[PDB]
C-alpha cells in the first residue's frame, strides 16, 4: 500500500516524470516478450505431440508374430491419447497468446489516454526546469553587476556613474528577486502535480502487473489441466496392461493360430476289397 | 488351463513347427520393445534440450519494465522442468539396457529348449515317414490283391497262384508291420507333443510375465517423473505468488528512482 513511486522519483534534475512515463511504455515490451515465450513453449509442445503421434504409428506397424503382438494396440491407443493431450495444450496456449495480444493492443489505448491526462504534469516539469535555469542566470547576472560595481568603486569613479551602476544592480536584483518568487510558485505546482502523477503511474503499473499475473495464472491452469489429463492416460495404460493378462494372450493365439484340435486318427488293417 | 496342448495337433501335424517358431518370435517382441523405449527417449530428450534452451532464453529478455524480475521465476522453473525430462531419458536408457540383456539371455534359453525337445522333432519326422510308407504299403498290398483278382478272373496256372499268394503274403507282412509301427509312433508322438506343447506354453508364460514386469518398470519411471513434473508446476505457482505486485513496485522504484529528496529551497543570496 506504500507510495514507492512518490517517495523515490524526485531528484535535482526533475527527470522523475520522464522515467516513470517511459517505464509505463516499457510495459508494452513485457507483453510482447511474454507472448513470445508462450509461442516457444507451444512450439516445444507441438514438436513433442507430433513425435508421439509418429511413435504411435510405429507401434501399429510392429510385427504381428508372437504372443505379445496384440499388446502393441494398448501402446498405440495410449500413445495416441498422450499425443492428443500435448496438442490440446498447444491449442490452449495459442488461445492464451491471443488474449496476451489483446491485452497488448488495449495497452496502446490506455497509454495514449494516460499521455493526454498527464499533460499538466509535463508542463509543470518543463516550467520548473526552465525557471531553475533562468533563476541561475539571474543569480550570476546579479553577481556580475556586484563585481563590476565593486571594481569601479574601489578604483575610483564619479558618484553619478556609480549610482547608475547601482541601478544596473537594482534591475539585476529585482529580476533575480522575481525569479526566486517564480521558482517557489513553480516548485509548489510541480510538487502538487508530481505527487498526484507518480501515484497515478504506480496504480497503472499495479493494474498492469495484476493482469499479467492473471495471464500467467491461466498459463499455469492450462498446464495443470493437461498435466491431470496426462496422468489419467498413464493410469489407463497401467490397468489396460493389467487387464491384458497372460491367460488371454495365450487364449487368443491358440484360437487364431492353432493348427487343429483333433489328434491324428487311428488306422487299422484294411481288406483288399 | 492348457490351450497349447488342446489346439495344436491338426492332420499335417504342423504343431511343433508352429510353436517353436512362435517361441523364436518372442525375441522380435523384445527388440520392438527396445525400439519403442529408445524412440520415446529420443522424444523426451529433444523436449528436454528445447526446454533448457527456453529456460536460458527467459533470462535474455529486456531489463526494462517493472515485470523484468519475474523472468527469473520462469528461468528457474523451466530449468527444473527440463531436468525432469532428462532424468526420465536416463531412466529409459537404463530400461533399454535390461531389455537387451533380457533379449540376449533369451537366445541362450531358446537354443537350450531346442536341444531339450529335439526328440519331439524326430517324432514328427517319424510319423510322417511312416504314414507315407503305410500309404505306400496300403497301395502296394491292394495292388497285389488287384493282381490276385485280375489273374483269377482271367484264369492261370496253380504255380502262378502260389507266387501271387506269397507276394501278397509278404505284402501283408510289411503292411501289418507298418500298422504296428504307426501305432508305436503315434503313441510316441502324442506322448511327447503333449509334454512339448505344455513346455512351449510354460516358457511363453515366463516370457509374457517378465515382459510385463519391464513395462511395469516403464510405467513406474514415467509415473515418478510425472509426479516430479507436477511438483515443479506447483513450485512455479508458489514462486509467482511470492513475487508480489508490491515487491516488483519496490524493486523498480529503488533501482530506477531519480531521487528521494524533493527540489530544494532557493532564497535570495547577497553578494
Curated annotation (Swiss-Prot), chain B:
Signal peptide: none annotated. Residues 1-271 are annotated as: Mediates dimerization and binding to membranes enriched in Pi(4,5)-P2 and induces their tubulation. Changing residue 8 to E: Binds preferentially to larger liposomes. Ubiquitinated. Mainly undergoes monoubiquitination but also polyubiquitination. It is found in: Membrane, Clathrin-coated pit. Residues 85-154 form a coiled coil. Residues 1-248 form the F-BAR domain. Functions in an early step of clathrin-mediated endocytosis. Has both a membrane binding/bending activity and the ability to recruit proteins essential to the formation of functional clathrin-coated pits. Has a lipid-binding activity with a preference for membranes enriched in phosphatidylserine and phosphoinositides (Pi(4,5) biphosphate) like the plasma membrane. Its membrane-bending activity might be important for the subsequent action of clathrin and adaptors in the formation of clathrin-coated vesicles. Deforms liposomes into a range of tubule diameters from 20 to 130 nm in vitro. Homodimer; disulfide-linked. May form homotetramer. Interacts with AP2A1. Interacts with EPS15, EPS15R, ITSN1 and ITSN2; recruit those scaffolding proteins which in turn may interact with the adaptor protein complex AP-2 at the plasma membrane. Interacts with DAB2 (via DPF motifs); mediates LDL receptor/LDLR endocytosis. Belongs to the FCHO family. This is F-BAR domain only protein 2. It comes from Homo sapiens (Human). The gene is FCHO2. The chain holds residues 3 to 273 of 810 of the full protein.
Amino acid at each position: 500500500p506504500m507510495a514507492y513511486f512518490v517517495e523515490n522519483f524526485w531528484g535535482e534534475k526533475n527527470s522523475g516524470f520522464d522515467v516513470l512515463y517511459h517505464n509505463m511504455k516499457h510495459g508494452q515490451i513485457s507483453t510482447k516478450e511474454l507472448a513470445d515465450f508462450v509461442r516457444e513453449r507451444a512450439t516445444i509442445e507441438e514438436a513433442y505431440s507430433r513425435s508421439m503421434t509418429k511413435l504411435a504409428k510405429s507401434a501399429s506397424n510392429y510385427s504381428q508374430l508372437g504372443t505379445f503382438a496384440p499388446v502393441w494396440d494398448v501402446f498405440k491407443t495410449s500413445t495416441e491419447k498422450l499425443a492428443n493431450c500435448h496438442l490440446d495444450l498447444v491449442r490452449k496456449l495459442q488461445e492464451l497468446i491471443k488474449e496476451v495480444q489483446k491485452y497488448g493492443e488495449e495497452q496502446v489505448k490506455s497509454h495514449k489516454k494516460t499521455k493526454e491526462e498527464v499533460a499538466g504534469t509535463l508542463e509543470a516539469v518543463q516550467t520548473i526546469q526552465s525557471i531553475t535555469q533562468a533563476l541561475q542566470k539571474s543569480k550570476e547576472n546579479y553577481n556580475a553587476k556586484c563585481v563590476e560595481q565593486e571594481r569601479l568603486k574601489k578604483e575610483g569613479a564619479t558618484q553619478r556613474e556609480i549610482e547608475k551602476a547601482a541601478v544596473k544592480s537594482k534591475k539585476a536584483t529585482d529580476t533575480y528577486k522575481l525569479y526566486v518568487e517564480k521558482y517557489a510558485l513553480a516548485k509548489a505546482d510541480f510538487e502538487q502535480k508530481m505527487t498526484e502523477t507518480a501515484q497515478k503511474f504506480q496504480d497503472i503499473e499495479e493494474t498492469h502487473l495484476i493482469h499479467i499475473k492473471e495471464i500467467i495464472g491461466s498459463l499455469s491452469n492450462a498446464i495443470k489441466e493437461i498435466h491431470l489429463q496426462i496422468g489419467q492416460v498413464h493410469e489407463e495404460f497401467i490397468n489396460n496392461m493389467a487387464n491384458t493378462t497372460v491367460e488371454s494372450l495365450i487364449q487368443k493365439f491358440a484360437e487364431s493360430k492353432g493348427t487343429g484340435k483333433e489328434r491324428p486318427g487311428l488306422i487299422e488293417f484294411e481288406e483288399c476289397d
